[PDB]
Amino acid sequence: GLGYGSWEIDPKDLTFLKELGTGQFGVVKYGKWRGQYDVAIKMIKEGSMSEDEFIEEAKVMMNLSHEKLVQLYGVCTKQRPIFIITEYMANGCLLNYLREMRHRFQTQQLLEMCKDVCEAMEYLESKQFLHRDLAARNCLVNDQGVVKVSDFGLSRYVLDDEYTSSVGSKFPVRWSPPEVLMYSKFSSKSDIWAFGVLMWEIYSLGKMPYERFTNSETAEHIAQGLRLYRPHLASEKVYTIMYSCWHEKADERPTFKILLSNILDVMDEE
Ligand SMILES: *CCC(=O)N1CC[C@H](Oc2nc(-c3n[nH]c(=O)[nH]3)cc3ccccc23)C1
């Protein structure tokens, strides 16, 4: 209506139904838009986010639509705190989902989770959009068990310096290639590295990568050319795919298109 751009949701159209959890920017709630449509409502804690830069980028993120990307519906801008309105994912965080041993996953289900994420990332790569923080903690699971990539590019708007620089206490060291840790070289190939680590998280049922090491020890390990090794649930062919993501030379890592082809080959063979 009158006072609203295409990227802007009237918060008066929201019904709040359940508290889901709290993350980086604060509380997430389940609700309805205009009485009918399931939404997630992220209440952005004051001072957590570069809000004007985020809102400008929200316009670009609105046009990123792929069935394996958590859809951005819009933002509630006129207020404190602002709200980010997204596709509701009833089964929550992929990391928590993997750690629930009751699911008793088949390796075919784990490969489907890798394929879901890989389709999302191939789409983002096709639009020259980097995720910049790909990990199981940034994937969500819907009521049908479909995995979707969430919070793509949002790390750019985090004001907490512990999260944003390589030797920050909250930087994702364990998902980062050597060139990111050594001189902050972000590229398509740092998303590829992260995707390899996400495949390892899935096949490890949500173990922490390098779980016996500190961030400092992890950085030294990977800089010296040492790597994660094969999760017990990963076949030789699955391990070959995740390992291909960790070539010391970034230009020798595959694309998301090549990874998707390799994952579809294994699905057919295994
Ligand atoms: C692993 C990530 C994490 O810790 N979270 C805590 C806050 C969030 O919880 C959460 N989010 C959603 C959701 N749906 N669409 C979104 O953009 N976020 C759904 C959901 C369902 C059940 C429990 C938590 C939860 C993520």
Side-chain angles (χ1 to χ4, degrees):
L2 186 49
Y4 294 98
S6 63
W7 65 92
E8 282 181 316
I9 279 164
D10 187 344
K12 299 189 300 296
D13 288 346
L14 302 172
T15 305
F16 295 86
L17 291 179
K18 193 157 101 287
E19 185 163 329
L20 289 177
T22 99
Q24 175 107 242
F25 304 110
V27 184
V28 181
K29 299 204 164 172
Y30 166 57
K32 300 286 207 178
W33 181 84
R34 296 193 175 169
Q36 200 144 359
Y37 295 103
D38 287 341
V39 294
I41 310 160
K42 311 166 164 193
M43 300 172 83
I44 307 305
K45 166 155 30 63
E46 189 160 73
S48 67
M49 175 180 297
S50 198
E51 296 185 3
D52 291 330
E53 292 178 45
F54 168 67
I55 289 164
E56 193 48 39
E57 187 69 359
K59 300 184 194 172
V60 181
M61 290 165 69
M62 293 277 310
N63 300 328
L64 295 172
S65 73
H66 187 280
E67 54 164 8
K68 303 300 173 61
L69 277 181
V70 177
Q71 186 63 64
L72 176 61
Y73 294 145
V75 179
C76 304
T77 57
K78 306 189 146 56
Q79 58 172 240
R80 273 300 167 286
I82 67 173
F83 305 158
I84 306 182
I85 316 302
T86 61
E87 173 171 8
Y88 175 57
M89 303 289 290
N91 275 322
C93 196
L94 177 58
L95 189 60
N96 293 1
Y97 187 74
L98 288 164
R99 289 174 177 176
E100 285 290 297
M101 296 297 284
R102 64 187 168 81
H103 294 303
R104 294 176 164 81
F105 293 117
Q106 301 186 256
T107 61
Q108 196 46 64
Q109 290 166 280
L110 300 178
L111 191 51
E112 286 273 8
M113 298 177 193
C114 299
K115 185 166 85 70
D116 291 339
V117 171
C118 198
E119 290 172 348
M121 293 307 303
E122 193 227 353
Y123 172 82
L124 290 183
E125 180 157 69
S126 82
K127 307 284 193 185
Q128 299 174 299
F129 194 99
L130 299 189
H131 191 287
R132 279 172 167 103
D133 192 17
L134 181 66
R137 65 175 170 281
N138 286 332
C139 301
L140 290 169
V141 186
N142 77 5
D143 65 334
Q144 308 296 306
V146 176
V147 178
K148 299 193 193 200
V149 172
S150 172
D151 290 357
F152 30 97
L154 265 179
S155 69
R156 290 174 293 172
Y157 312 110
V158 175
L159 287 185
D160 188 346
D161 282 356
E162 288 287 26
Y163 285 86
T164 61
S165 69
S166 60
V167 199
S169 96
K170 305 282 175 169
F171 188 85
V173 170
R174 296 157 195 275
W175 290 265
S176 294
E179 70 275 3
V180 162
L181 293 188
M182 289 164 70
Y183 52 92
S184 308
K185 198 180 189 321
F186 294 89
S187 72
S188 64
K189 303 303 187 187
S190 54
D191 278 2
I192 295 288
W193 178 289
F195 175 77
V197 178
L198 183 174
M199 286 185 67
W200 184 102
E201 291 185 276
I202 288 173
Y203 277 87
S204 303
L205 303 181
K207 283 185 195 317
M208 182 157 308
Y210 318 93
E211 60 178 350
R212 289 182 181 280
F213 292 164
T214 65
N215 279 342
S216 303
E217 286 169 330
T218 300
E220 186 53 48
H221 185 82
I222 70 105
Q224 289 176 13
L226 304 177
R227 298 296 184 253
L228 295 165
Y229 65 96
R230 180 175 160 194
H232 296 139
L233 283 166
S235 70
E236 285 185 25
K237 287 174 186 171
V238 168
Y239 182 50
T240 296
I241 297 168
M242 69 179 74
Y243 199 87
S244 73
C245 294
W246 308 323
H247 283 111
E248 185 164 291
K249 301 174 172 192
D251 58 31
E252 292 183 353
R253 296 171 204 151
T255 62
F256 283 112
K257 189 161 203 211
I258 286 157
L259 287 169
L260 179 56
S261 184
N262 297 343
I263 290 163
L264 286 164
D265 289 341
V266 173
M267 289 200 166
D268 284 341
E269 294 160 15
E270 294 190 345

